Design an enzyme around this catalytic site. Structure first.
Site, PDB file in Angstrom:
ATOM      1  N   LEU A   1       0.804  -1.165   0.029  1.00  0.00           N
ATOM      2  CA  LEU A   1       0.262   0.059   0.114  1.00  0.00           C
ATOM      3  C   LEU A   1       0.888   1.282  -0.088  1.00  0.00           C
ATOM      4  O   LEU A   1       2.156   1.276  -0.235  1.00  0.00           O
ATOM      5  CB  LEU A   1      -0.922   0.177   1.166  1.00  0.00           C
ATOM      6  CG  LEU A   1      -1.901  -1.201   1.342  1.00  0.00           C
ATOM      7  CD1 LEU A   1      -1.859  -1.936   2.515  1.00  0.00           C
ATOM      8  CD2 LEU A   1      -3.387  -0.863   0.761  1.00  0.00           C
ATOM      9  N   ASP A   2       0.163   2.422   0.302  1.00  0.00           N
ATOM     10  CA  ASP A   2       0.817   3.587   0.149  1.00  0.00           C
ATOM     11  C   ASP A   2       0.977   4.442   1.531  1.00  0.00           C
ATOM     12  O   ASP A   2       0.190   3.945   2.466  1.00  0.00           O
ATOM     13  CB  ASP A   2       0.339   4.688  -0.997  1.00  0.00           C
ATOM     14  CG  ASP A   2       1.117   5.745  -1.373  1.00  0.00           C
ATOM     15  OD1 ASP A   2       2.285   5.761  -1.154  1.00  0.00           O
ATOM     16  OD2 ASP A   2       0.696   6.490  -2.224  1.00  0.00           O
TER      17      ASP A   2
END
Lengths: 177, 128, 50, 87, 155, 459, 606, 171
Positions: free
Chosen positions: D41-42
């Protein structure tokens, strides 16, 4: 700015702090859940518009103008959690957080009605007074010249050794006395 | 556009609007590292003097005693009588006294003159 | 507290009230005015002549 | 009033909030999953997830502590040390 | 305690300033003493005149109520800037704009109250007609004297 | 007054003949017995003074001050018997001897029939207070405070001596009864100007007047608890009693003379109170509160109206008891934390509940909470000064704010908030301290029921 | 005579005896709040009986039962004055305080120091009973300072929270300004009338009565939280919720209004004081309603609401209708206690989440609480045949057909519209809508104490307004002949406010974003009043306390004038005197010069 | 008991309660229950205490003072008789203050007793109060905190001199 471990806030930390504060203020200004979700998606898209950047100066005054716009569009009365500072219930039960060392001043008449707990407290006090010497021996050698540079403390290294300066964190008072 | 924040004596500039916080020069980096090292050394000294099992008493804070002695007993040995201190002492030390004395003398003269000519309503004033 | 609660009619002050209970009783019987505006008798005062 | 909470319930509620996320899948989500390394993810997703648990549990986690809550077990650890579990 | 750990006179040359910064445990550049106006500040440094509310509460302080670390050289006027006293936190609106808005609002309302006192409102009816010469006897008038009688008629 | 002097002169060998472990108990028992016998002076009249002989008399003014003095001495012996437990037996007996001699000096001074005897006894009160301050004080610079106190008193009181001897040589006597019956008006002349100044400046020094109050913020701090109590609760009232006696002799010049001095208080008690808003030392805050109360006393005595006199004596007694209690509280906290810094010890309510209750009661009695004696006295002073002039209500009313604005502030920082972490030697409350503070407080709340005995000579 | 005086005095003694009971305690009490609640209820009955006999007959009296002081020509005695105001105020306050007993017994059960809390609140009620039944002015002063000090204590109940300490200090400062005004009025009355009793003041009727009226106006501004000295009432919201429900809503905040109600024969013959009170009340109610327009904390909203009602009561005092204001007190207390108490129930039910932006969906989860809140809001607005309609609407009928100020009536009506707006705003945000609380639902109100207490307050708000409005003797002449457009003014203003607030809430419900205007920033930052003055008025004081009074004068200049110049001259000329070289020739030359000067320049031998 | 002349009271006129409704008033039953429960035991206790008083009776008397020549018949700087004159003057001052207290009590009792008709039914009390405070101000006011008989004599002489110049300027 003012952090315990790091001496400065990097660009990533500033961006994430601005994003979190913007989301909090937007949730304050957009009371209903669906409007808040829609404008949070819009704000995430706006943040992802300038995510992939290669010039540091461009990111610098882009963050400057973004912070100016966030200051202009803030809620005058932002929502604050009850346990957060500035809240209605902040540090209330801190008035009832009596420290443990006062238990050393009790009368023997009122110490006789909790025998087992005071025996376990005596064992903990003995453990502290036998761990202090090796914890300060550990902290003496590990400290370099000029003292420690960061506020981070070294953990327990040898088996059977407690972490240095552990009493006033492990025996801190409970949240709900 | 936007209304730019104008700081005053009772309204400080926000920390995130400061240009000096957005400086990535090396000198600011060594200044931050040096003040972090100083704060870490002081914190280490405090929690070394704080977690001692043998100690049962007051941990001495040199900064507090320094502040109290600077506030209380070190104001007169570092005083020089100059024109600024003389003007501030003449404006604040004797000005209110002479102003209050003049207004009270005027009021009491007016009250005595009104009473001695028999015009002030003092019919039921028997407690003084 | 027992001693200060029972001083014997302090400063004769209560007695003064009792004396007042007599005096107006006199002056409401003979038609005299309630209280004279001169503390001493004016017939025994010699003003400085001018 | 004010019922106590247990650590099993804490991880159950945290996995419940995680498992409703649309940028995550309910198959390879585990309690020792790194969000960018083992899950992908970020950082924006990380701060938004931290804000999601801040709204869920009703108290504010500071950013200095928020940057390090990097796995669901670490989030459970922070909630556990904040709320004084296993009393 | 000892004599050379205590404040002294105003330093002038660089090495006295360095010794003062060593005593006050700041940098030699962050140590800015008060100007020598003969007021008595001595060698006490000038902190940036900020309230303790401006400090981050999420930091773990040695004194959480004052947000001050142990041995941190405090402000010369620290008792003015405690959390129960005068603050310097930033406001959402500008200070001068706040002051002019409040002053204009209260002046406009006071002028409106003045022009309303000058211009009253009432109901288009006559006065309250009272008996017995506008109640002379019940108002404390002496019954031995007979004032001018007013008489209220039908309509 | 030979029924009270001889018991003190017999108390002197009573503390010079006891054992090393029985001095405190015997002295406390016998001083409390003398305090019990002290109530026989209340046989007063609304029109006459109780005269015993040619040298001693006591009206309704000096009697509450006498009762307060020989009630305060046993409290002094309780308050000063712990921090002197490490001292030598000879020095401990010398300390008790100085306290007993000071009580004897005060009870001889308050009943002086003639003014010259009052003056010499008034200057004789200097010696044991100066000895206590310069010997048993704690801080380094106590010699400066002792020198300042002694020199302010002497430089005030020597023109008082010259004026008193001049008055005695002029008219013929210095008896207060004779001067009450042989009083003469003083015209508006410069000789009478300097006569008024010489007769007043000693008492304005010992009150202290604002401007000449600088001997108080030092001598009230570095002195021990007994010296602090005898400086705060007796000697200022000694100067006030002297001024009350003297101001009969200086009419009608004062009606145009006391314009600056009154107003030298009427502004000063404002800004000195403001100093209590910005004080880091608790004992200095208590001393400046005493300065403000004595400035109110100065205004009340100098306007010479009856209600002002009643308010002056009531505020004198109430402020003496309250300041003694506050000084005892400061001494107890300083003993527990080994520092006089107010900002250091915080959150004492969570550790000391009964001491927090005593702090609350003392702070409430300091801000003139009705129906205590302090509210009665200050209210009577405000009525009298409003009778004097109108606008002065402002100069009192703003003080009504600032007093609260420090006193509850003194209640907040020392009691309310998160407690200090590194301070872990806060012992539970000693029975001696609780007994001393109850003995300070309960007489005030009991005299709140029957204040008619402490309202002055002309009630 | 025999029943009335004995029953009133034993009402007072019954209310004051648990203080001695808890002060003479050795063991741990078994349900001490239950004992004090039974004491409060028994005192309510024992005070309601002579109220009933006064309604039957019309008997008022004054008892000076303890000769305390005989100071000069003034006589001060423990005197209780039983008249209409005390008669019809004491049972209402006792009933509200009984509901406060029950709600505090339910609410603070987790607090280990609840006995000290109940002792503090009971002794507060003792001080207020001293206040409202005071005959001479000194007893009213005693009650004033008692309720101020114990308000400080109950606000600073949680001493560890420094915000509560700041609020308590602010309240103390504003109460001391009110005391400035009250002491000025006391001084003028004693000087120009030689009395502290109300009877002699009413009998004398002074002509130039402007200065005591201004003093009492300043006192009422200080205590009743009028404009200029308002923000302590909304700032004191950080204490416990029973404290806010009892003190800061119904009982304490009407003390200055009660004092000016007591002084109606002095303001019945003076136009200037009436105009001043009217303008001040209109200012207060409009400013507080505008501040309450756009707030987010519920308790802050209700505090601003009761300040606006205090301003409206100030307005209806200013038009020479004092018993209408007393009726408005007796009607206002019930539903304001209801609103605050149901709000506290909701706050405890949702884990102390006080902001109304994290609410909704409580219309069916809290049925009894929603019914209580709806009835309280309707009584607040002026819904016909409720309690508020029996007072509030009536003063509107007296606010138009009178020789009054036009702008004051205008902002009175605008304030009424604003009250309706924020009441239905609170209804729309807290009760209606969709849930916003965290996912752990802990909604529960099935407790007999809370249910019975809110039921008693609900019956009170339903019928006590009717009972009081139909049972009081007719004191003045009500207005009857008056046109139709003025008759529906209050109802039309309320309905227009409801419609406009529904429209703005609906437009808030849409999917739009708008940057805040300056009006919203004005109405959200409390009219910019606490943001400026509390950062400027202390600071400008405190620097004067350091750079002008402590360091500049009392440590330097006063040390320089008298002692240090003298000491410097002494040491300097002493150093000049003792700087001899020890030479005998110089000494003998000085002897020669002295002899020559004495023989010639002074001529000592004549 | 008290003397009726020094504290007068007009006779009371309590109306007969005429019932017009069928609902019985509970206040009558409350008064009957109060007299059945409270009046009888308190009356019995007071009767027992009165019997115990009447077993052993003793008297106390009211002190009186004869007349001495006042301060105007005293030689100056002669203490042994002018002291007695000052003593008697202070006693008269205390008694006169009590007289003013009596008049104030009469005025307040009149106002409270007449209630809403105080503007009409207490003219005599207010007139007597005004007279006595005018005479009190003419006698004792502005004396100072150190008042004596000499000061009051000087004030009376000054007032009579002002009266003399008033009648001289009017003739």
């Amino acid at each position: 700015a003012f952090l315990p471990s790091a001496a400065y806030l990097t660009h990533q930390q500033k961006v994430l702090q601005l994003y979190k504060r913007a989301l909090r203020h937007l949730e304050s200004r957009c009371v209903h859940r669906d409007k808040y979700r829609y404008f949070a998606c819009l704000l995430r898209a706006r943040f992802d518009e300038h995510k992939n950047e290669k010039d540091m100066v461009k990111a610098t005054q882009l963050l400057r103008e973004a912070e100016k716009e966030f200051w202009h569009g803030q809620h005058p009365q932002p929502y604050i959690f009850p346990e957060s500072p500035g809240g209605t219930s902040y540090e209330r039960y801190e008035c009832y957080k009596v420290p443990e060392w006062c238990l050393d001043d009790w009368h023997p008449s009122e110490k006789a009605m909790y025998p087992d707990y005071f025996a376990k407290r005596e064992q903990w006090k003995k453990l502290r007074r036998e761990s202090w010497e090796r914890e300060v021996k550990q902290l003496q050698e590990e400290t370099p010249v000029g003292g420690p540079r960061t506020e981070a403390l070294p953990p327990a290294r040898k088996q059977g050794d407690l972490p240095p300066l552990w009493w006033h964190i492990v025996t801190r008072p409970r949240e709900r006395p | 556009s936007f209304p730019k924040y104008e700081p005053s004596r009772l309204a400080s500039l926000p920390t995130t609007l400061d240009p000096a916080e957005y400086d990535i020069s090396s000198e600011t980096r060594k200044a931050q590292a040096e003040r972090l090292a100083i704060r870490s050394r002081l914190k280490r000294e405090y929690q070394l003097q704080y977690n001692d099992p043998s100690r049962r008493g007051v941990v001495e804070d040199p900064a507090l005693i320094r502040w109290t002695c600077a506030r209380s007993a070190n104001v007169y040995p570092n005083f020089r009588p100059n024109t600024k201190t003389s003007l501030l002492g003449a404006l604040f030390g004797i000005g209110p006294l002479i102003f209050w004395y003049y207004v009270f003398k005027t009021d009491r003269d007016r009250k005595e003159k009104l009473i001695q000519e028999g015009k002030l309503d003092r019919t039921f004033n028997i407690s003084y | 507290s027992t001693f200060v609660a029972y001083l014997p009619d302090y400063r004769m002050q209560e007695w003064a009230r009792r004396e007042a209970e007599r005096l107006v009783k006199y002056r409401e019987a003979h038609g005299l005015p309630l209280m004279e505006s001169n503390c001493f008798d004016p017939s025994k005062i010699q003003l400085p002549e001018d | 009033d004010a019922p106590p909470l247990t650590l099993e319930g804490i991880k159950d509620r945290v996995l419940y909030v995680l498992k409703l996320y649309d940028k995550i899948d309910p198959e390879k989500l585990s309690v020792n999953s790194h969000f960018m390394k083992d899950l992908g993810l970020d950082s924006l997703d990380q701060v938004e997830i931290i804000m999601a648990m801040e709204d869920e549990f009703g108290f504010e986690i500071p950013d200095i502590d928020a940057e390090k809550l990097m796995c669901p077990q670490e989030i459970v650890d922070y909630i556990a040390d904040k709320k004084d579990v296993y009393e | 305690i000892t004599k050379d750990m205590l404040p002294g006179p105003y330093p002038k040359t660089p090495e006295e300033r360095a010794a003062a910064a060593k005593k006050y445990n700041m940098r030699v550049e962050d140590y800015e003493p008060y100007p020598d106006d003969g007021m008595g500040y001595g060698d006490y440094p000038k902190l940036p005149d900020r309230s303790q509310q401006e400090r981050d509460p999420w930091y773990d302080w040695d004194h959480p109520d004052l947000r001050l670390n142990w041995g941190e050289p405090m402000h010369w006027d620290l008792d003015m800037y405690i959390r129960n006293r005068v603050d310097t936190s930033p406001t959402p609106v500008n200070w001068n704009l706040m002051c002019k808005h409040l002053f204009g609002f209260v002046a406009f309302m006071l002028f409106m109250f003045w022009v309303g006192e000058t211009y009253p409102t009432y109901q288009p009816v006559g006065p309250k007609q009272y008996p017995y010469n506008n109640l002379y006897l019940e108002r404390g008038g002496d019954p031995n004297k007979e004032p001018e009688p007013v008489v209220h008629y039908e309509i | 007054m030979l029924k009270y002097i001889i018991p003190t002169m017999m108390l002197m060998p009573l503390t010079w003949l006891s054992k090393n472990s029985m001095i405190w108990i015997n002295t406390t028992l016998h001083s409390l017995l003398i305090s019990l016998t002290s109530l026989l002076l209340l046989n007063q009249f609304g029109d006459n003074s109780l005269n015993f002989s040619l040298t001693f008399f006591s009206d309704s003014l000096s009697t509450p001050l006498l009762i307060l003095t020989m009630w305060l001495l046993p409290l002094m012996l309780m308050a000063s018997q712990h921090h002197l437990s490490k001292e030598n037996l000879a020095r401990k007996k010398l300390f008790i001897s100085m306290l007993i001699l000071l009580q004897l000096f005060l009870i001889m001074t308050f009943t002086a029939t003639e003014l010259i005897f009052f003056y010499i006894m008034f200057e004789a009160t200097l010696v044991p207070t100066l000895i206590i301050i310069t010997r048993w004080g704690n801080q380094t610079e106590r010699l400066n405070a002792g020198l300042y106190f002694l020199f302010y008193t002497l430089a005030g009181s020597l023109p008082l001596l010259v004026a008193l001897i001049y008055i005695q040589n002029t008219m013929g006597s210095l008896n207060f009864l004779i001067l009450q019956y042989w009083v003469q008006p003083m015209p508006n002349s410069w000789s009478n100007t300097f006569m008024w100044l010489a007769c007043m400046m000693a008492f304005m020094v010992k009150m202290p007047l604002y401007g000449l109050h600088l001997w108080l913020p030092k001598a009230h701090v570095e002195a021990p608890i007994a010296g602090s109590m005898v400086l705060a609760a007796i000697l200022l009232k000694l100067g006030g009693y002297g001024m009350m006696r003297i101001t009969l002799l200086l009419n009608p010049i004062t009606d145009f003379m006391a314009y600056p001095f009154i107003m030298l208080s009427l502004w000063g008690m404002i800004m000195t109170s403001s100093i209590c808003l910005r004080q880091t030392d608790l004992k200095s805050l208590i001393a400046y509160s005493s300065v403000s109360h004595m400035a109110l006393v100065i205004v009340a005595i100098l306007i010479q109206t009856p209600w002002s006199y009643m308010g002056a004596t009531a505020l004198m007694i109430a402020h003496g008891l309250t300041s003694s209690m506050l000084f005892c509280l400061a001494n107890s906290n300083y003993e527990r934390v080994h520092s006089r810094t107010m900002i250091l010890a915080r959150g004492l309510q969570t550790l000391l509940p009964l001491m927090a209750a005593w702090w609350l009661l003392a702070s409430l009695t300091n801000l003139a909470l009705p129906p205590s004696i302090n509210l009665i006295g200050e209210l009577f002073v405000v009525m009298s000064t409003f009778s004097w002039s109108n606008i002065t209500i402002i100069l009192m009313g703003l003080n009504m704010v600032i007093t609260a604005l420090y006193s509850l502030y003194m209640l907040i920082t020392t009691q309310r908030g998160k407690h200090t972490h590194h301070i872990n030697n806060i012992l539970p409350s000693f029975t001696r301290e609780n007994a001393l503070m109850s003995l300070h407080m309960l007489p005030l709340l009991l005299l709140s029921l029957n204040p008619k005995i402490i309202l002055g000579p002309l009630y | 005579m025999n029943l009335f005086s004995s029953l009133t005095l034993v009402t007072l003694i019954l209310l004051t005896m648990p203080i001695a009971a808890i002060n003479f305690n050795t063991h741990k009490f078994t349900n001490y709040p239950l004992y004090v609640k039974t004491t409060i209820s028994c005192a309510f009955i024992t005070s309601m009986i002579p109220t009933m006999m006064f309604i039957h007959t019309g008997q008022e009296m004054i008892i000076s039962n303890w000769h305390w002081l005989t100071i000069q020509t003034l006589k001060l005695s423990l005197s209780f004055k039983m008249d209409f105001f005390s008669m019809m105020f004491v049972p209402v306050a006792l009933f509200v305080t009984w509901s406060i007993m029950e709600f505090s017994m339910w609410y603070m059960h987790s607090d280990p120091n609840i006995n000290q809390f109940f002792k503090y609140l009971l002794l507060f009620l003792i001080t207020m009973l001293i206040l409202v039944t005071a005959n001479n002015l000194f007893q009213l002063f005693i009650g004033w300072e008692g309720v101020g000090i114990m308000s400080f204590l109950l606000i600073g109940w949680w001493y560890g929270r420094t915000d509560a300490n700041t609020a308590a200090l602010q309240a103390i400062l504003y109460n001391r300004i009110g005391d400035i005004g009250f002491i000025l009025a006391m001084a003028w009355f004693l000087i120009n009338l030689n009395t502290w009793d109300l009877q002699q003041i009413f009998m004398l009727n002074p002509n130039d009565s402007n200065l005591p009226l201004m003093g009492l106006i300043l006192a009422a501004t200080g205590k009743s939280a009028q404009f200029g000295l308002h923000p302590w009432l909304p700032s004191a919201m950080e204490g416990p919720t029973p404290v806010s429900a009892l003190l800061h809503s119904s009982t304490m905040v009407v003390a200055g209004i009660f004092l000016l109600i007591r002084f109606y024969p002095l303001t019945e013959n003076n136009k200037f004081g009436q105009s001043i009170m009217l303008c001040l009340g209109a200012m207060t109610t409009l400013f507080t309603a505008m501040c309450a327009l756009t707030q987010n904390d519920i308790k802050k909203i209700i505090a601003f609401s009761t300040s606006s009602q205090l301003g409206l009561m100030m307005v209806t005092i200013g038009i020479n209708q004092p018993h209408l204001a007393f009726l408005h007190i007796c009607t206002h207390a019930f539903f304001k206690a209801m609103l605050f108490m149901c709000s506290g129930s909701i706050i405890h039910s949702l884990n102390d989440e006080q902001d109304i932006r994290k609410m909704g969906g409580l219309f069916k989860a809290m049925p009894f609480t929603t019914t209580a809140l709806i009835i309280g809001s309707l009584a607040l607005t002026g819904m016909p045949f409720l309690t508020g309609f029996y007072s509030k609407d009536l003063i509107i009928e007296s606010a138009n057909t009178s020789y009054t100020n036009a702008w004051a009536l205008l902002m009175t009506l605008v304030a009424t519209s604003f009250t309706a707006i924020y009441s239905t705003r609170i209804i729309f945000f807290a009760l209606l809508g969709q849930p916003r609380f965290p996912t752990l639902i802990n909604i529960n109100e099935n407790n007999p104490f809370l249910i019975n207490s809110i039921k008693r307050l609900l019956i009170g708000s339903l019928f006590a307004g009717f009972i009081i409005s139909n049972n009081i003797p007719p004191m003045t002449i009500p207005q009857m002949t008056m046109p139709h457009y003025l008759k529906m003014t209050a109802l039309t203003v309320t309905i227009l406010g409801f419609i406009l607030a529904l429209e703005i809430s609906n437009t808030t419900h849409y999917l739009k974003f708008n940057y805040p205007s300056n009006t919203f920033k004005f109405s959200n930052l409390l009219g910019y009043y606490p943001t400026i003055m509390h950062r400027l008025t202390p600071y400008m004081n405190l620097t004067m306390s350091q750079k002008s009074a402590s360091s500049l004068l009392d440590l330097i200049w006063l040390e320089t004038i008298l002692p240090k110049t003298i000491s410097l001259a002494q040491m300097k000329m002493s150093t000049t005197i003792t700087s001899q070289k020890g030479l005998i020739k110089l000494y003998f030359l000085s002897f020669l010069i002295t002899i020559l000067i004495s023989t010639t320049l002074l001529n000592f031998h004549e | 008991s008290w003397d009726k002349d020094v504290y007068p009271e007009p006779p009371r006129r309590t109306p007969a309660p005429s019932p017009q409704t069928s609902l019985p008033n509970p206040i009558t039953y409350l008064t009957k229950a109060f007299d059945l429960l409270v009046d009888r035991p308190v009356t019995l206790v007071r009767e027992f205490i009165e019997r115990q008083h009447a077993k052993n009776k003793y008297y106390y008397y009211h002190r009186e003072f004869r007349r001495v020549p006042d301060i105007t018949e005293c030689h100056e700087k002669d203490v042994l008789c002018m002291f007695e004159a000052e003593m008697q003057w202070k006693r008269d001052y205390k008694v006169d203050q009590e007289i003013v207290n009596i008049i104030q009590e009469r005025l307040k009792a009149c106002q409270q007793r007449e209630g809403e008709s105080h503007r009409q039914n207490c003219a005599k009390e207010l007139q007597q109060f005004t007279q006595v405070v005018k005479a009190y101000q003419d006698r004792y006011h502005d004396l100072g905190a150190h008042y004596s008989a000499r000061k009051c004599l000087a004030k009376q002489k000054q007032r009579m001199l002002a009266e003399r110049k008033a009648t001289k300027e009017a003739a």
